[PDB]
């Protein structure tokens, strides 16, 4: 533990550089408004006194236009149907919710969407009947490559007519992949008598067609699903109403914050203008990076909070929402606390069956590489995704190696006799800053692309090495102190 005045100076410098970089980005946005407008069309609305909105973010624009038309009404329908089923027929709630999910998927994706989901589920089940984990994973990978096939893309774009329904179908099938993979692997591993009646085709269909997580929702474990779907004990509708009220208030606050950021600063258009990235200043560059990561954080708060609220109304325990990215300081912490459901899926079904940290450093290398390669191929398998995956694999490996080297008894006693706990905390903060810079660069390659990545690398670490790099590392050192001091409350 550091003295409180030291910790306060660190937190003060952290908030200072955050807000000054945001102000610089706002200035540059206001200054290049008409050029950015004639290049990318900016939306108008009276929500913020007349400022124009940057609507270049594909995911935000896509999910907002789908939700304002269909998804919010279908989710309200699921809520009321679930409550009526809990009130009238508590034992038939899973099948009632399955029928509602099938009808909603039909209503929003036509007959081909339901047909494709049913086909994938049926094939996965019929292959899981062999009870071979290798064969199950092979079937899942082939079903996932069927999405990456160009001729299949052509046939599906021919199926639909508005070109957003095709993307909705692609995302739905991509998530269904993980869902039926989890089901089939648990079925392959089942050995317990009382668990024999859980892996039936009706249960698989009820798991796959659970509307709160049908299109984009996080990965819910089948164990938790079938545990909650057989409880028979309701949860005090009077308290459900208050849960709903507080969830709606919090979700509206998050949505308003995201819209405020998108109205104030044109981070996405600026990232789309590489000649402008090359000319903006370093404060604006770092502010663009912070704005990107925080907008992604708030966007996924919103995208995951609606399924989480619906699950909490249904009585389930959903995976935890992401921790604020302004408290992450390491690859390991980032990838353990950002996407909890997917992290748990990976740990359970990719990491351990290949062999995790229990079979040596080479086994750890192989398992971590397998996990990140699968994550890249599932996110889409573009070159920038493979680059992001390689950088994150390298970061995780280096952090594991350094931690294992430090936690040896010899070196640990050497440090414990040479340096004070304060000095050890400060050395850990310096290393955490040196790791946080690369974490940010890798995730900027994820968010912007390879050209944005090389621009940031060249302008921060090559062209401005002697002093820009040192300033960035000092700010990240203060930020790392703050994050490490906060991490004790939950680690």
């Amino acid at each position, epitope marked *: 533990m550091l003295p409180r005045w030291e910790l306060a100076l660190y937190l003060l410098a952290s908030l200072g550089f955050h807000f000054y970089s945001f102000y610089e980005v706002y200035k540059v946005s206001r200054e290049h408004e008409e050029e950015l407008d004639q290049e990318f069309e900016l939306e108008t609305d009276t929500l913020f006194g007349g400022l124009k909105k940057d609507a270049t973010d594909f995911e935000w624009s896509f999910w907002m236009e789908w939700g304002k038309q269909w998804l919010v009404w279908l989710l309200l329908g699921h809520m009321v149907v679930s409550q009526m089923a809990t009130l009238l027929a508590r034992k038939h709630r899973p099948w009632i919710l399955m029928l509602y999910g099938m009808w909603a998927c039909w209503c929003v994706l036509g007959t081909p969407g339901v047909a494709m989901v049913l086909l994938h589920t049926t094939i996965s089940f019929c292959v899981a009947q062999f009870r071979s984990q290798l064969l199950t994973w092979l079937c899942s990978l082939l079903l996932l490559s069927t999405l990456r096939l160009q001729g299949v893309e052509e046939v599906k774009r021919r199926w639909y007519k508005t070109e957003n329904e095709y993307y909705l179908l692609q995302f739905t099938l991509t998530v269904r992949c993980l869902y039926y993979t989890s089901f089939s692997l648990e079925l392959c*591993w089942q*050995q317990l*008598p*009382a668990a024999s*009646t859980s892996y039936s085709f009706p249960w698989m269909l009820a798991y796959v067609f659970y509307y709160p997580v049908l299109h984009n929702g996080p990965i819910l474990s089948f164990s938790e699903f079938i545990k909650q779907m057989q409880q028979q004990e309701h949860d005090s509708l009077k308290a459900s109403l208050c849960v709903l009220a507080l969830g709606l208030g919090r979700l509206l606050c998050w949505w308003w914050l995201a819209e405020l950021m998108a109205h104030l600063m044109y981070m996405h258009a600026i990232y789309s203008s590489i000649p402008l990235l090359e000319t903006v200043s370093c404060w604006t560059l770092g502010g663009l990076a912070l704005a990107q990561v925080l907008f992604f954080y708030v966007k996924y708060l919103v995208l995951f909070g609606v399924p989480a609220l619906l699950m909490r109304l249904d009585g389930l325990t959903p995976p935890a929402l992401p921790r604020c990215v302004s408290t992450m300081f390491s690859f390991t912490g980032m990838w353990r606390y950002f996407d909890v459901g997917l992290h748990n899926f990976l740990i359970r079904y990719v990491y*351990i*069956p290949v062999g995790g940290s229990q079979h040596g450093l080479l086994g750890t290398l192989f398992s971590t590489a397998m996990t990140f390669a699968f994550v890249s191929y599932w996110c889409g398998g573009y070159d920038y995704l493979w680059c992001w995956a390689a950088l994150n694999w390298l970061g995780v490996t280096v952090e594991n190696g350094v931690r294992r080297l430090v936690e040896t008894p010899c070196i640990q006693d050497s440090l414990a006799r040479y340096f004070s706990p304060q000095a050890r905390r400060r050395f850990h903060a310096a290393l955490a800053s040196c790791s946080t810079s690369m974490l940010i660069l890798s995730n900027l390659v994820f968010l912007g692309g390879n050209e944005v990545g090389k621009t940031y690398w060249n302008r921060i670490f090559i062209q401005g090495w002697p002093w820009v790099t040192l300033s960035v590392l000092g700010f990240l050192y203060c930020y790392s102190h703050v994050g490490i001091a906060w991490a004790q409350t939950y680690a």
Partner: antibody, heavy 113, light 111 residues
């Protein structure tokens, strides 16, 4: 289908113990394996089981922290650091559905003094 | 879950009807909707052997004189004709609530 255990063990209260159970006549990895203990002045008591396909053990709360199950996939081992527990340890196979213990081992007697 | 057996030990003559009672502390009904309560017979100096596996069911090699009835919290094992190979210790066992617990054991003897 038969399960055969290691044999009698005479050891002092401080040593550890490793008992083995070899199964023949079926696909070892298709079914789980349970451990039961029978003290002289007590009845049967379930200690825990271990998934044979994935190697994941689960112990009862009472027998936690000291005992450990392990695989050699077609043998299965139990390990512990001792106390005044002179029970007889049985090895049992669990079935896929509708009933638990269809086949048992012969039993391994443990003496501490 | 605590399972109590009655009686603790009973003498029987060759060719009598025998009824052993096993009472749980709570309901042995599982979330699946069926209760996993089963009966084991252990002869002196060897391993237990399953006789009844679900309430009123019967294991493969078991004879046809081991009918076992049972309610949701009270269960009974019945031996029609004690054929001199049914002597030993009888345990009831529940597999519905973790951890799984055996009964106290009932000892048949000859008068």
């Amino acid at each position: 289908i038969q399960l055969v255990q290691s044999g009698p063990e005479l050891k002092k209260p401080g040593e550890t113990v490793k008992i083995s159970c070899k199964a023949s006549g079926y696909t070892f990895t298709n079914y789980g394996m349970n451990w039961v203990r029978q003290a002289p002045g007590k009845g049967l008591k379930w200690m825990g089981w271990i998934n044979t396909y994935t190697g994941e053990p689960t112990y009862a709360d009472d027998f936690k922290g000291r005992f450990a199950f392990s695989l050699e996939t077609a043998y299965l081992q139990i390990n512990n650091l001792k106390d005044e527990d002179m029970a007889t340890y049985f090895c049992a196979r669990v079935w896929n559905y509708d009933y638990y213990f269809d086949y048992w081992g012969q039993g391994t007697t443990l003496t501490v003094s | 879950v605590l399972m109590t057996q009655t009686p603790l030990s009973l003498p029987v003559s060759l060719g009598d009807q025998v009824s052993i009672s096993c009472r749980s502390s709570q309901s042995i009904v599982h979330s699946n909707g069926n209760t996993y309560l089963e009966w084991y017979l252990q002869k002196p100096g060897q391993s237990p052997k399953l006789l009844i596996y679900r309430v009123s069911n019967r294991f493969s090699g078991v004879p046809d004189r081991f009918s076992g009835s049972g309610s949701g919290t009270d269960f009974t094992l019945k031996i029609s004709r004690v054929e001199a190979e049914d002597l030993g210790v009888y345990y009831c066992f529940q597999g519905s609530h973790v951890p799984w617990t055996f009964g106290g054991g009932t000892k048949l003897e000859i008068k």
